[PDB]
Structure formats: structure tokens, C-alpha cells
Amino acid sequence: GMQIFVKTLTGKTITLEVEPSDTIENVKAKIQDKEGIPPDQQRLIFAGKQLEDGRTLSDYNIQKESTLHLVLRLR
Amino acid sequence: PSSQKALLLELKGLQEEPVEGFRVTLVDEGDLYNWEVAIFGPPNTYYEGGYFKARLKFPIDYPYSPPAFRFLTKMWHPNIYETGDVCISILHPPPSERWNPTQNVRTILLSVISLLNEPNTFSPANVDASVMYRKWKESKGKDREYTDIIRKQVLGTKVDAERDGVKVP
Numbered sequence: 001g002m003q004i005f006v007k008t009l010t011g012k013t014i015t016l017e018v019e020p021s022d023t024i025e026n027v028k029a030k031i032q033d034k035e036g037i038p039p040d041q042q043r044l045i046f047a048g049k050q051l052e053d054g055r056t057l058s059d060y061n062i063q064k065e066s067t068l069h070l071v072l073r074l075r
Numbered sequence: 076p077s078s079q080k081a082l083l084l085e086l087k088g089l090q091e092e093p094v095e096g097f098r099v100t101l102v103d104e105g106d107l108y109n110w111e112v113a114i115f116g117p118p119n120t121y122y123e124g125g126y127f128k129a130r131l132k133f134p135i136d137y138p139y140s141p142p143a144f145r146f147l148t149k150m151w152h153p154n155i156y157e158t159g160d161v162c163i164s165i166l167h168p169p170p171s172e173r174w175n176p177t178q179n180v181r182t183i184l185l186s187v188i189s190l191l192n193e194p195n196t197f198s199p200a201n202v203d204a205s206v207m208y209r210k211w212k213e214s215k216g217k218d219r220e221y222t223d224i225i226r227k228q229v230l231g232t233k234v235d236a237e238r239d240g241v242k243v244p
């Protein structure tokens with residue numbers, strides 16, 4: 001159990017309760033929970049890299065109290 | 076003009092809380108409508124070790140009109156013209172991808188990070204690079220033509236870094 005953050009483009013910070021092994025696809029399931037934005041349109045960025053779904057938080061070494069940056073892509 | 080004050084606050088805001096991998100300055104001190112952007116390629120990427128340079132042109136309407144983003148470094152990318160100009164949806168004059176007065180430089184810069192991560196193969200500025208990028212992604216990385224061009228350009232930025240006196244982090 002950890003506590004990470006997700007900053008958005010408007011300025012709000014979204015703190016979410018995750019595990020180090022949570023897949024990125026589930027991290028954005030929790031963001032449709034809180035903001036209603038479809039998970040297919042979300043893009044999380046950590047250390048200048050778009051975190052891909054099908055990988056864990058531990059695959060990109062995201063620790064406690066980390067901040068991710070959400071950007072949106074229609075596609 | 077409100078554009079001048081908006082750009083001073085945004086420069087100060089982006090220098091106190093930098094976008095990671097981005098360093099913003101003024102081309103000439105006293106002109107807030109013309110920014111120097113020094114981008115750094117992140118680890119675990121084909122751009123690792125790079126030192127790329129770009130420039131931002133802000134209009135007097137700012138933020139009611141989008142600025143212009145132009146790489147000085149040559150870039151091989153499906154959404155970067157031969158001039159260096161980047162075709163991003165947000166920089167186009169007229170939802171979160173289109174320009175509004177609510178958008179800021181931090182929004183632009185993060186959008187450029189996303190666009191470097193995932194090219195928009197639907198509106199290619201460099202068709203030859205878009206058609207080269209897609210055979211890379213469909214080969215699942217096997218075809219190395221695209222990543223060879225990228226790595227050649229990334230290797231050459233080391234000369235640029237020495238001239239500007241920049242220690243690549």
C-alpha cells in the first residue's frame with residue numbers, strides 16, 4: 001500500500017491509494033472513478049515517459065508520494 | 076498589455092517549478108515574447124543523453140492566441156516539419172487538445188512530452204517519418220531505421236551541448 005498523486009492540466013492534484021504492483025490500466029480506472037474521463041483517453045507521464053498500460057507501477061519505479069501528470073489524447 | 080505580465084508570471088512559475096526535463100529562459104532579457112527552451116532526453120528512451128533546443132514565440136494576444144514552438148535542433152519525428160516547427164493540436168489557432176485562453180506554457184510543454192512519446196500518425200507533418208515510425212511499431216521494434224535516425228541525431232547533440240556549456244544530467 002502506497003499513496004501517489006496525479007496532477008492535472010487545470011492544476012488539481014488527485015491523490016490515489018494504490019499498491020506498487022497496480023497495473024497502470026487500473027490506476028486510470030480509479031481516475032474514471034473520480035473524474036469521469038474515459039481510461040482510453042488518459043495519458044500518465046512520469047519522468048518524461050508516458051506510462052503504458054499492461055505494466056505495473058513498480059515497472060517504472062513509482063514510489064510513495066510520487067506525482068504523475070495526466071494529459072488527454074482523444075485517439 | 077496583459078500578455079507581458081502573463082508571460083513574466085509564467086516564466087517565473089516554470090522556473091520555480093520546472094517541467095521535468097525542460098529548462099526555459101529568455102532569448103534576450105527584456106523580451107518576454109520569445110523563449111529559449113532546452114529539452115533533455117530522459118533515461119530509458121531512444122532520446123537518452125540528448126540536448127535538444129527549441130524556441131517559443133508568443134503573440135501580443137497571449138493567452139488568447141497560441142504561441143509557436145520551433146526546434147532549432149534537427150528532429151526526425153512524424154509531427155515536426157523540416158523547418159523545426161511542431162504541429163501540435165494545441166498550438167493551432169481556433170477539447171483539451173485545442174487552444175483556449177485557459178491553456179498555459181506548462182500545458183503546451185506537457186503536450187509536447189506526450190507527442191514525443193506517442194506521435195500523432197493521423198496528421199503527419201513529416202510523412203516520411205510517419206510512414207517510417209509505423210513500420211517500427213508494427214515490427215514491434217525489429218525494424219531499426221527510425222531508431223537509427225533518432226539515435227544519430229541524439230548522438231550529435233553532444234556537440235551542441237559542449238558549445239553551449241551544458242552538462243547533460
Ligand SMILES: CCNC(=O)C1(Cc2ccc(-c3cc(Cl)cc(Cl)c3)cc2)CCN(C(=O)COC)CC1
Pocket residue numbers: 047048049050095096114115116117119120121122125127188191192193222225
Ligand atoms: C522512437 C522513440 N521512442 C522512445 O524512445 C519511447 C517513447 C518516448 C518517451 C519519451 C520521449 C521523450 C521525453 C522527453 Cl521529456 C524528452 C524527449 Cl527529447 C523525448 C521520447 C520518446 C518509446 C520506445 N521505448 C520503449 O519502449 C522503452 O520502454 C522501456 C523508449 C521510449
